[PDB]
Amino acid sequence: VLSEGEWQLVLHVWAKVEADVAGHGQDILIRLFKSHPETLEKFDRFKHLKTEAEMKASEDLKKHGVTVLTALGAILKKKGHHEAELKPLAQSHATKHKIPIKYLEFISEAIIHVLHSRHPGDFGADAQGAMNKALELFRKDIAAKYKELGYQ
């Protein structure tokens, strides 16, 4: 678990992200798609995007970025007591979308990267460490649900 101090660093920087959900959202998905091309193949919706320019220019990709971050934010703000917000997500990602846990790890690295570029002042080592732990907690609980369903 994260301490009250670690959660503070996480939510303090996440408030900065909420000031521009769409901008952070498009950057994170683009980072994910460029860094790990195999994640892009999972999305029938964005499978056609070949260049980075095409990705930045897509309104639907940007719309999905909002959906991912808002859903992540609801989880983060629960500070661990996110069972009700996490279960539905794991169920659909395991059985419907078929997202392996490794991809959730890839998107966590993409999130940490984007937060560093956009908010260097409020995302130093300490804050980066806290966010990493919160994203691990996220993956840990999802994996436990995946195992239960038989997707581990």
Q: How far is the CB of 64 from ligand HEM (least distance, A)?
A: 7
Nearest C-alpha neighbor of 152 from the set 93, 109, 89, 86: 93
Q: How far is the CB of 39 from ligand HEM (least distance, A)?
A: 4
- The dihedral sign for the CA sequence 61, 83, 129, 103: negative
Tell me the CA distances in angstroms from 104 to 4, 16, 27, 76, 124, one per residue in order.
Answer: 25, 22, 16, 15, 23
State how far the Cα of 150 lies from the Cα of 152, in Å rounded to an integer: 6
Map residue 63 onto helix, strand or coil: helix
Q: Binding site annotation covers 93? A: yes
5 versus 54: smaller Cβ distance to ligand HEM? 54
Please name the helix (run of DSSP H) or strand (run of DSSP E) that holds residue 95, with its range, or none: none
7 versus 46: smaller Cβ distance to ligand HEM? 46
Report 27-86 residues binding ligand HEM (CB under 6 A). 39, 42-45, 67-68, 71-72
44 versus 59: smaller Cβ distance to ligand HEM? 44
Residues that bind ligand HEM (CB under 6 A): 39, 42-45, 67-68, 71-72, 89, 92, 97, 99, 103-104, 107
Binding-site residue numbers for O2 are 64
